[PDB]
Amino acid sequence: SAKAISEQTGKELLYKFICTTSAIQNRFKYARVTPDTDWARLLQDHPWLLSQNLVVKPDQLIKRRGKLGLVGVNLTLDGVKSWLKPRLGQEATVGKATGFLKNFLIEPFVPHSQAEEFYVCIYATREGDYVLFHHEGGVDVGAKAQKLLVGVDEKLNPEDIKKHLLVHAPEDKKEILASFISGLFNFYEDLYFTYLEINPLVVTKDGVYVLDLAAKVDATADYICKVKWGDIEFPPPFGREAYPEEAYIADLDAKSGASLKLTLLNPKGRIWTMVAGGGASVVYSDTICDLGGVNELANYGEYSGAPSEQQTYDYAKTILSLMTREKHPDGKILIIGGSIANFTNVAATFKGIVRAIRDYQGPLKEHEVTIFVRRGGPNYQEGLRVMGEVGKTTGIPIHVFGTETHMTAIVGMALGHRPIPENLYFQ
Template identity: 45%
Template sequence: MARKKIREYDSKRLLKEHFKRLAGYELPIKSAQVTQATDFNELAEKEPWLLSGKLVVKPDMLFGKRGKSGLVALNLDLSQVAVFVKERLGKEVEMGGCKGPITTFIVEPFIPHDEEFYLNIVSDRLGCTISFSECGGIEIEENWDKVKTIFLPSGVSFTSELCAPLVATLALEVRTEIEEFIKVVYALFQDLDFTFLEMNPFTLIDGKPYPLDMRGELDDTAAFKNFKKWGNIEFPLPFGRVMSATESFIHGLDEKTSASLKFTVLNPKGRIWTMVAGGGASVIYADTVGDLGYASELGNYAEYSGAPNEEEVLQYARVVIDCATSDPDGQKRALLVGGGIANFTDVAATFNGIIRALKEKVNLT
């Protein structure tokens, strides 16, 4: 399972598109995405609700605590939203120790509300942990003692009986509605292969739940069966992370092949580099380097699997070797080539690609 964060805009888009199919009624979610390329006049034509009421605007950049950081503007009209965005678009901010420019915003209707609820679903190997609180919002951490949690094993139906501990303290007039909402969101979570979903907060509008703030992660290895359901989904890099030219090249190879080709530069001046077959093995190799006290020398994380052909491995190995030898500081480098059990990969083909890349490098030096 590969957990990949998605933007709040896409989380809410998926919720809106599929909630009616699973629940029988539609959530009145409205949201618009704003980037450098956005023309506000064209956006208003496409989304006329932007001109009919007050709005909320905030960065949609995979980091939290936007309200506490003064990055959320409330009760604006569209012209004020445009000014807010213009003043911040492309500006560098620091969040959680990471610095990066703000490139994407989400705009939504401003919804006055009194009640704020919290819902969180996280999957793991044996099932899902579901947490709920009637004291949601930006102070959720200060009210963590009020969060109720249950664990739902894989394959077990999410019945009202199992949901009861989460909603037991709610007022009777909203208990049934919120219970049904939680169960439908869980069904959607499973149906779309979410690995993490959080609404903090959601509120009630005319007695129906409505998410005000939402975060989501998808299992991107399930893309092959969800491409129609997910639509034009984006998996942005973590905030503050910029893909290098070599990483972009490997990413392009990965998108064009049925195999898996992953490459991340950790330390361009590192002296220990890896090229490992298999997701589990690649993590073990990297962890072992760290456990032996050489984490600061680890140059990269690399993983190839899924039976890449010789030519794909050749291009992949060229990049790893070029990066490993790019710093002419006179120090020796180590390249760890290995893997785990090969279930269906042609090991001879992959190693031929690696050997050819090594021979090319020798002939060039």
């Protein structure tokens, strides 16, 4: 999938790799600050922070930071530290997401007129990449920009840009704008971006300044692009944090053609899922939330693509570790679900889950974990047997269902909407 990169990541890549005739100003002049920053050392590394006034703003995939009072403009370093005091380390809500402001960027302030702000965007679609230009960049950008489709095999030369896109642009700026945009588009293509927006791009008598950058890259292109991407980082959306379990599962997912994916939504949630399949895992999630349980849904997660019994054990062990971190009055629930697999060996996979339940049987009982299983596919009868079997041999209560139960029925069960029909067990 396409994954957002931080402003800092994108800007370093552009500063490294863009080819233009433009003089791009202030290359690599940015500093990163967190609540743990050693500011003496920061200023040892970035003496330019004293050389002129500054801009400070969070770099956490927050949009519309200016409208949120989250861009500090034309400040002395001391003014920056004052601006950050009520912000850095504080909880903040943006839209409907709540997170800590913990990662900020400081850059030279760049004096300019509003007539020197420009909007540029490039984004991918089925038929190619659209390139947007407007001579009214800035926070009030608001079906008014020039916009050009570049086809899948088409090239974008400065000459094309002046022609299609720069019609409204100051004549003296056309050459440098065209050069920069052609370079940006080449950069965009070579590094497998899918979205790249610079708002604003500034062009003064002294050259081209990139004041803001938002971008997504196609993370599947790592095998092509790793030399240039380097150790590229894909930050969570604002509102979430990253857990080593997620990074752990991800490492598993990168080693085989099997898909293994974990996202923690609410670690304290009492409703856990270990579902097979992209679509199915979505559907169960849909159902858990259609039935009111969104606040208790702990994770989005799916295995699939025929994971081995070992891969399956290591997935399940992570889930079972994360739902036995903290008890809950009403206990916990685990939804081990899926469609009727096409080729995943249910018996091999559930034998991995069983062994993980077996290893965590003690904790699972002490958190009052109740397990519901529904599954089809190759060898699924032997899959179900071994789930029922570990259920007895540990005292845990496991309710095992097959192709005869509707896929999501088990969720209504696990939440009390409907009774548990023991007349479908193992069927």
